[PDB]
Design a binder for these strands. Structure first.
Ligand SMILES: [Mg+2]
Length: 476
RNA sequence: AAA
């Protein structure tokens, strides 16, 4: 039996790719995968059903997982008659792992052995896995689905597949999309457009694919070629209909151009197809907020008459959708911050607070996103609740979690104004002392940082944070 | 899916 458990780990499939269930909302993934099967016909059905099966096992539904794996076998027979045996390895891997979890050891073995046989047949240098670009590609996609944390591992996976077939249409889409997301991940300030080239190439290799095209259009918006982008959008919309995975990215395009009504039209159309989508609900709320803001700016932050009436309607709508986004994807960090921010604007602080505090307890979202929550809660504390003590705290956490980001200077500027103010009132305010300590340390003003920590330590001598700072402050 |  220990021999079997050893062999399982050697297999190449979802069970050995470190896809941790904690890093996602299991229901959202299971749901959206289901929706991708119905409404994203470009993507591999065999891959989605292999992934679905694994997801279902993470939900503790091993019986349904097998059923999913059966669908895959049928798809293997259908789409991959030729190259049947080699397309079965991942499916067979999930089978062996799923049966092992159901304590059907004899059955689990039947699959590993079935996998072993195929490996020597096409003698790969490994006994229970065969390196393959299509599998590297499936790997890339599963990784992507498990969120921000996996993007680099995803990128590499596609890179491994493209190493073999640099001109494969499918492979290029995966890579291009991955680099496109990494353009929007862990930004330090300005926008990134490493993905522009790979998308160019992806599109050329996939002429009829409007899903890949929409990313090129958005990436062209990002780099101030809005004209070229919008023409790409118009071409797509006249070329496809009611494909939620395409309409929603066109909606985004229009939204940023401030064409909110046209964005709302496209979203709504995507919605009647896929009404539970957290993507769509977020984008909707964003449009209502923006429209709401446009009015406030046009009335110097104090609308009267039908304006105030409209603004309150927009707020309520934006709340409805942010909440929907949040309820559908418990891992959707910006669903929480936008919801709470809108509750704040609405003056329902109790609701703002409850949403923020849930967002502050998400352990497994990325540091970049943790960082944004600390930032927004900090502002809520400062401007709505007027608690400078609490805001200073959260600006510090934001920087501690991620110190180089487009928020860096908003955070250090805020910490400096607040700490100075509070120190003009009480020169012995410790939190404010360690605050300027931390910031000056961050800015490289090593001496001023030391002075601030020394004043802090004089007040709170055996503080292990201030002792640590002064030390590491002496170590350059 | 925010900036
Ligand atoms: Mg999603």
């Amino acid at each position: 039996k220990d021999t079997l458990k050893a062999i399982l780990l050697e297999l190449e499939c979802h069970f050995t790719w470190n896809l941790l269930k904690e890093d996602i909302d299991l229901f959202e993934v299971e749901d959206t995968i289901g929706q991708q099967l119905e409404f994203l016909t470009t993507k591999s059905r065999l891959a989605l059903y292999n992934l679905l099966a694994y997801v279902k096992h993470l939900k503790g539904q091993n019986k349904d997982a097998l059923e999913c794996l059966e669908q895959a076998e049928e798809i293997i027979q259908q789409e991959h008659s030729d190259k049947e045996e080699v397309r079965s390895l991942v499916t067979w891997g999930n089978y062996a792992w799923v049966y092992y979890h159901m304590d059907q050891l004899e059955e689990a073995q039947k699959y590993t052995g079935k996998i072993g046989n195929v490996c020597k047949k096409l003698s790969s240098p490994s006994n229970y896995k065969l390196e393959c670009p299509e599998t590297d590609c499936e790997k890339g996609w599963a990784l992507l689905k498990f969120g921000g944390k996996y993007y680099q591992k995803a990128k590499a996976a596609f890179e491994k597949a493209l190493e073999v077939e640099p001109d494969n249409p499918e492979f290029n889409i995966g890579y291009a999309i991955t680099v496109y997301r990494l353009d929007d991940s862990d930004r330090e300030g300005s926008v990134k457009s490493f993905s522009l080239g790979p998308l160019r190439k992806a599109v050329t290799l996939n002429p009829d694919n409007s899903y890949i095209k929409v990313f090129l259009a958005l990436k062209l918006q990002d780099v101030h070629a809005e004209a070229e982008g919008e023409k790409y959008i118009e071409e797509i919309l006249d070329q496809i209909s009611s494909q939620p995975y395409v309409l929603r990215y066109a909606a985004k395009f229009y939204r940023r151009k401030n064409s909110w009504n046209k964005a709302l039209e496209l979203l709504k159309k995507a919605l009647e197809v896929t009404p539970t989508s957290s993507f769509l609900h977020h984008q909707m709320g964003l449009c209502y907020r923006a429209q709401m803001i446009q009015i406030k700016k046009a009335t110097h932050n104090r609308p009267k008459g039908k304006d105030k009436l409209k603004v309150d309607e927009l707020i309520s709508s934006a709340i409805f959708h942010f909440k929907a986004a949040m309820e559908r994807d418990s891992m959707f960090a910006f669903a929480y911050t936008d919801l709470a921010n809108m509750y704040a604007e609405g003056g329902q602080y109790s609701n703002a607070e409850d949403i923020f505090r849930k967002a502050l307890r998400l352990e497994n979202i990325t540091d970049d996103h943790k960082h944004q929550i600390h930032y927004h809660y900090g502002r809520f504390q400062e401007f709505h609740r007027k608690s400078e003590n609490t805001a200073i705290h959260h600006y510090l956490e934001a920087l501690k979690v991620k110190d180089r980001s487009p928020l860096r200077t908003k955070l250090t500027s805020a910490l400096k104004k607040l700490s100075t103010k509070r120190l003009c009132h009480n020169a012995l305010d410790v939190q404010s002392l360690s605050a300027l300590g931390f910031v000056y340390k961050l800015e490289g003003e090593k001496r001023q940082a030391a002075e601030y920590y020394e004043k802090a330590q004089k007040i709170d001598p055996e503080n292990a944070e201030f002792l640590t700072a002064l030390c590491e402050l002496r170590l350059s």
